[PDB]
Structures are given as C-alpha cells and as structure tokens.
Amino acid sequence: MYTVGDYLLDRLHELGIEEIFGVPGDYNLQFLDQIISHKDMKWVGNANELNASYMADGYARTKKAAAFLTTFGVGELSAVNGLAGSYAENLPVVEIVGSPTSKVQNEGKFVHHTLADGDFKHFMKMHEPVTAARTLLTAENATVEIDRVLSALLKERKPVYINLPVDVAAAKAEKPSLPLKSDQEILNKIQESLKNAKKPIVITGHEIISFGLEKTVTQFISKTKLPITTLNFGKSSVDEALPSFLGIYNGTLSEPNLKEFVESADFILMLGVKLTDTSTGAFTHHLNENKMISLNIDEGKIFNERIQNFDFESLISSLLDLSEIEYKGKYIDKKQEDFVPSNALLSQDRLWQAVENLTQSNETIVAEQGTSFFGASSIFLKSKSHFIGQPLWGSIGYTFPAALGSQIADKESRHLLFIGDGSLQLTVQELGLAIREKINPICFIINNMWNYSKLPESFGATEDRVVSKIVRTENEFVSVMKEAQADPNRMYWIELILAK
Amino acid sequence: MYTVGDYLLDRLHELGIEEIFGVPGDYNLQFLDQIISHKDMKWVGNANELNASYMADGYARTKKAAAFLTTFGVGELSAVNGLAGSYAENLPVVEIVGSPTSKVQNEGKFVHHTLADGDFKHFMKMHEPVTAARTLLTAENATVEIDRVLSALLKERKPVYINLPVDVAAAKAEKPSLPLTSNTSDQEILNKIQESLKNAKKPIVITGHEIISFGLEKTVTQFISKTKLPITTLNFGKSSVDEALPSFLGIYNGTLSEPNLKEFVESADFILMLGVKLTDTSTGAFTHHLNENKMISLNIDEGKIFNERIQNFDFESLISSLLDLSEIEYKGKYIDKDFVPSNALLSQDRLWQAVENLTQSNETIVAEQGTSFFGASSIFLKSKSHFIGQPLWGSIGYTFPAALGSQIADKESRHLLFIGDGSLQLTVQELGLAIREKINPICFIINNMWNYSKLPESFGATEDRVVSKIVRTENEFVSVMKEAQADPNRMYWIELILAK
C-alpha cells in the first residue's frame, strides 16, 4: 500500500535527500520502518538528536537539502538548537517529529514526553521562530500540508517542521501526480553598472550556498573575469582557485590589499550576503550603499532603493546571460612562499600556511569556531573545493557531526575537519556513526581534557578503518597530511599539538 | 561595588542554592566571575548545556532549588529540553541566560548567536510554555524582576528564566533588605480531611511528585508516622514518603501493582491524594481505579473535595497543617509483605531482589527509563532514602548528570545510579566533572558499541579516584555492592552484564 509516510519520503527524494538522520523513539518507530523499506532512502541513526540536527545541517550544505527524524517532546526539543542554527545560516533542513496517535492527542491524555497538561501543540509553537513553515499532519490534510511546507523549503531554503502522528503516517494516500517546483530591470541595471565600473567588486555570501548556486557564480566570474571576494560567512560561495578571487573580506581584519581594493571599488555587487559581527571584523566593513546593488533571498537594494518582488535563484542564474562584460583591470598581488618544513614544533600560523600549500582539489574543509576557524577561513582553497563554518550561529561541537553529514552527502569530496579538543567533546559520540557508515574524513583535532587519541579504538575501530596519529612538528604534519590524502579508503584521526 | 549580579546571587543563596551549573560563553563571562567571588556559591561547569540543565534538575530534586547559567541563543536552546523536563515534573530550577549588552540589543545588530534579524526576544518567547515566569533584566527593573520571578519559583516550584545582559549584571544595586496565607478555606479543607479520616474504616494516602517539589517529604513522613495511616506512592513521586515506614504499602501503578496493594487501594473507603498527577507510565497505562466520589485530592494549582474543585489555597502550608490534625490513628491491618547469592549469572529480577536487600539507609537511588526504572521503582527503599526517576518526561541520558547534581546537592547521601549503556552515551561527557569534583557515586552501567569500562582512565581518573568493575554473577554482584558501599571515598564505575 502507499501511505502518507511513503508520500513524505518520495517527496523528500525529489528534493535530492538520499539519507535521513535522527534517533528512534516510541512515537516514530513505525515511520522509521518505512524509511528502511524505501530503497532510495537510507537511515543513518545518531547517538543524540542534537548531533542529528547538526549532521542534517552539514548534509544540507553539500546535498542542498536534508532531513532528520526525532520523537515528540524530548527529541524535538533536543534538536532545537541547531535547527535554530539551520534557520540562522539558511540551510534547507526538514525536521520530522513522530508524535502520539491523533486519538491520544485529541483525548488530551497525560502520556510520556508531555507536560501532563494534555496539550500537544506547545513544542510546535516553540519552533515558530526557527522554521519557515510548520504543520501538524492529519489524515485529511497530510498530502496538502507536506507539499505546503516542502514548497516553503524550496522558496526560502530555511528549515521546516512536520509533526507526524503514528496513525497519520500509516494512513493511505495517493502518490505524486504533480511535482513541487522586475528581474529584467534589475539585470540591466547590474549589467549597465558593470559595463561602466572602472573597478567593480562582487561579494557573495552564505545564501549562495543555501541554493547551491556556487557553480553558477563560479561560471559567471570565470567568463567575466570580475574581481570577487567572499565573507567568511559564505566562504566557498565561489571557487577560490579562480584568478579574480581576491581573498576573504572581513572588515579591517582583511589583508590590506584586498581591503583597499574592495573599499575603493566604484561598484559593489553583493549576492546572498549578511553582515554579521564575526564576518565583518566587528562591523569595521566599509561598503558604501550608494555604489552598491545587493541581492538576497528575502529582499535586495539597488543604490539604497529596496526591492521586494523577485526570484533570488533565477535572478542569480540570469547573471550568466549578461553580455559584453569583461574586466580588463588588475587584481591584487598574491604570495608564493612554499612551505618548507623543519623539525620545528608546529605553530598556529605555520599550520595554516601548511594546510593552504598541501590542500588538494575536490576537498571540503570544515573548521570549528576558535583558532581553527580563524586560521582556516583565510586559506585560499584549491579548485572545486568547499568550506563549512558556522560563524553566525557559532554553536560549539557543530563541525564534527556536520563534517560527517557533509561527507555522507558527497562521497567524492574528501572532507578535512579542523576542530578543537574542547569542542569535539560536545558531539564526539558521533564517532560511532563514522565507524559504522565506513566514511573516510580526515579529522584534525587540535590540542588546547581527556585522551582522545585512542578514541576510535574505544568505539571499536581497527587500523583497517581508522588511522590514529599524533603530530608535533612540521615534518610530521607534512608527512601525515600527504599520507592521509593518499589513502581515500580510511578515516584519519590526527591529534595536532601546537607550539607556544 | 555591589551589583545586580551580586543581588541575583544573594537571592539564589536564600533559596538554599550553593552551587550553580552551566557553560561559559562570551555573553556570561563577567557574571561567571561574580559566582566565583561569592564565597557562599560554587561554580560547577559542565561540558554541555543540556547536561547542565539535567544536572540542575537532579540538584533541585535534593537541594529543593537549583540554578544553571547558559549563553544567549546556542546555550539556552541547548538546555531547553532539560528545562522542559523540569517544568513537566515540577522542579524549581532557575535558568540564567547571559545575553549581549543592552546597547547591542536595542540597536538590533547582527551579532553571533542570533538569527541576524536584530531580534533578541525570540528565545525567551520559545521558553514561554516551559517556564512559570520569565524576565529580560534592565538596570532599572532588575531587583523587582529578579524578585518577581524568584517569587513565582517559590509559588509554583516550576523552573523560571532570567535573561541577564552583560552590562545589566555589572550595574549598581542595593543589597536586599526584605526576604522573598492566601485563603481561610484552608481551615475548612483541613476539617473535611480530618472528619473523613476519623470516619474512614480503611483510608489510603497517596502522595506524588509535587511533595518532592516542595521538599515536603519529611512532613508527610512525620504525618504518616503519628497517624499510622496506610500510604502508597506512584512511581511518579517515588520517595515522597519514607518507604521504611510500616504503613507504607508499596507502589500503586494500576493493574501492574502487587495484587494485595492493588486490592487495598481500590477497596479503600477514603482516598487522600497529595501532589499527585496520573500519567500513563505511573498508572498501569491508565488501569488505575480511584473513585473520585470518596477522594480528596490536593495539588499545587488546584484540588478536589469529593468532585468539588477548589482554586484558592496555599499548597505548602495546607500539607504542613496535616500535622496539627488530632485524634487520627489507624487501627487496621495493612498488607502482607531474603537474598542468597549463587554463581548463577545475574538476571534482571535477581538484580533488583539483590539491590533491595543490599541497599542501605541514607542513600539516593537514581534509575534511568527502561529495565532499570521498571525494576528499581518496585523496590522498598531503606530508611531516610531517596529516589530519582523521570517517568513523565522520560528523557534518556537524564539520570547520569541528574545523579551527579543530586550527589553534589547532598554529600551525605550515597547515590546509586542504574543506567543503561544506550542512555549513558548521550550524557557521558559529564564523567569529567565527576572526576574533577571528587564526588563518590556508585554507578551501575547495565550492558545491553563502545568500551565503557576504560572510560574513567580516558577522563584522567586513577584507581585512587574511580574503581572499575565488571559483574556477571550473583556472588560478584553482592561482593562489589558491599565493597562499594564500604568505601565512601571513591566513585565506583561498575559494568553489569545481565543474563537471559
């Protein structure tokens, strides 16, 4: 039989979701079965819900849609932080919440995972400010409601919430039938501005990643040869290997040449950007609104004139159909110091120098808030690479599960995680999943309270699965980097000890 | 100078809170210092916020008030699930949330830990359905607001929320001078209770969780002692009376109750229910038979005298008044109510038989949902003992941090934790705190896939701090139980392997 559960899963498939994360609970058991049954969908169960939500986030970053399952009350409220972070940084994550039978909910009984007030609507209400759409399904409204909220996900690429009562998931429903899903004036104004500019700057941001427009932007920048920079909030919204990519613009913390280039530009095109404290060097950015066109998901501005009505995705896509754009100016001077290692102990500055030099193409780099994010975000990535950081929401522990989710999202991109020992502790339990799912990320755990080196062994990993290293010197670092990248079939668990 | 922070902490001292849990964050650092400075208050920092909230809950259960500190956004939303569970089971927990300077909040800036919408009020709104009172402090309203919400905590003994902006915590304030009877229908009620009790040929007192909430356990025990009244508790409120009393019957849990108790309770001619809430898991899936027509029930918010609702009364002093009843003495019969180990492997039923026989006085027993809770809740505790279970909210992982919090709350009560391997994983990181704070609980981890045995060693414990055991047989169990109870200066990490 085809059921509501089936409908939801097929819909999720259409969004490109191939794995669902989460945690079994009594009110979501039956639907969990349905996920198993669907051959086009794989269940990847976490240790805890919060980890699940983080892992779905990372998955969304790469796969461009994600979903995870929790249980009413205890599950959903565990995940809320981190669904919040998916709202803040605009990732398309579906949260499915298995709830008691509608019979139980209507009778308002004091059942487990409630406040024994017979109210089944509190937790959805609590999810209001961190979801673009929500629904409590019924047998009648199910197909309509699923479609409504998944549509909102497509529109906004912000997380959405579906409360799925046991019996509603098992109820019959009819398959698919139909799939789910001022621009001209704007384009001309952009094109006119670009033809006129003697020194333009494109600045792209997180919302580009949200809609998986990275390749569009890259292709746009390539043909035009337009100067481009990103914020750290949206690092990799363009291929950093392009010759017209300047580096990261981050207020007065920007490298001086980039800073001067950006802030002396005669035209600014900002795409999918939000200026936050940590992404603008504590608001020390100088982006004159009078010579700037900015486009975002929800709104945009043409030279201080707000625009309301447009389609963000296709408006960006249209940048490719512009014409007679070619930048003939200079850029900024880069640097070509090779990392030559010694037996010197590894320092922070040397680490990132080495990472930049040794990183390869087709890699995703994930960096946790703290020394790791600060160092890693300034790196120029290799061609066809990606970056995951969470500098707006800034939830510690995030990058570990996120890294794993992302790695699962794209097996073809080798993930390199940079996380501090302090932070890793908060989400370390997902090491279990890493071992089970036989995924192969390169994990660097920077030191500075437990002995993490021998953690894989504790979780039941052998040397055929995880390789554990300790690095103290430059030579050791180089060696282990190359060794790790040379072996795509094992996960690497590398403890860095940094000097001074 | 004396500050708002100081005010809050002095107020917290008056509630009897001697330790504050939580996690440092940039928006709560300065206030954290204030906790350190206060000699009558000790900071006990957790690994994660969720753990903190669970640990505060456990602390409240024993100390009868608790507090923990988180950081705006990421911190508070991490803890929300534990706070929800504190609301559900009615524990007096203060959540303090350090937030950005009021200057920043008013200017509505896109700072870290926000949704970059310049709204600072979302997260408090999300806490609405799980707090009895909430406040965003200002320099002006601080003393009033602190007192308002801490008063509500006193009234309802449900959790409360204080958002504390950096600058507001540092703002000048005066030491509190004043410290923190509703109706005379209390007198009528007492007489009706007394009249009913004198007349009853077979009365039953049933006490519940709300008794623990107000620390009325000793009152109830003294009441039952003088009168010799038959008493039973639900598992939702186990230990709301001293189970060692001769008139304590056991646990009433619907048709899952021991037959004699079941028949006693359900054939009673008068029922006095104090602080009771009937949930699915605490009745036998609602197989309780408590005739409302021969029953007086008192709760925090409301009560019923033979199907006549009362609204306005003081729960605490109304219970306290039960002691001033007179010419109450039960003259009736009660119900009818020893472990020899072998080399036989340890089974579930044998475990709890052994625990019941070997448990000592002045102990707290903490049991996680699943097998542990089912077995442990049926035990008769020794004199002056306590029980922690969370059968309403039923959040897995809870009992580990909760156990630790409770243990910190009362150093004089030896905690015995019974948790499943599955659940321990969710909150295991707090093992760090256990080692640091040099507390000495007896932890039984039922094994039912990582190597937990070597966990203390990982977290830096030596044999002088934690003793690690593996138990398979009955003899081994008895031996390790006695050995653990015989050594009050070390924590015990005991892995139970159960049979079929």
Author numbering:
A (entry chain D): 1 to 181, 190 to 456, 477 to 528
B (entry chain C): 1 to 180, 186 to 342, 346 to 456, 477 to 528
What does the report in the manuscript say about this coordinate set?
The 2.8 Å X-ray crystal structure of KivdS286T reveals a tetrameric assembly composed of four polypeptide chains. The tetrameric structure is consistent with the results obtained from gel filtration chromatography, confirming that the crystal structure of KivdS286T represents the biologically active form of the protein. Due to low electron density in the X-ray crystallographic data, several disordered regions were not modeled. These regions include residues 181–187 in chains A and B, and residues 180–195 in chains C and D. In addition, residues from 456 to 477 and from 529 to 548 in the C-terminal region of chains C and D were not included in the model. Each KivdS286T monomer consists of three distinct domains. The N-terminal PYR domain binds the pyrimidine ring of ThDP, the central R domain lacks bound cofactors, and the C-terminal PP domain interacts with the diphosphate group of ThDP. The enzyme’s active site is located at the interface between the PP and PYR domains of adjacent monomers. The ThDP cofactor, crucial for the decarboxylation reaction, is anchored within the active site through interactions with the conserved GDGX25-30NN motif, which coordinates with the diphosphate tail and an Mg2+ ion. Based on the tetrameric crystal structure of KivdS286T, one dimer contains the essential cofactors ThDP and Mg2+, which are required for the catalytic function of KivdS286T. Interestingly, the adjacent dimer lacks these cofactors.
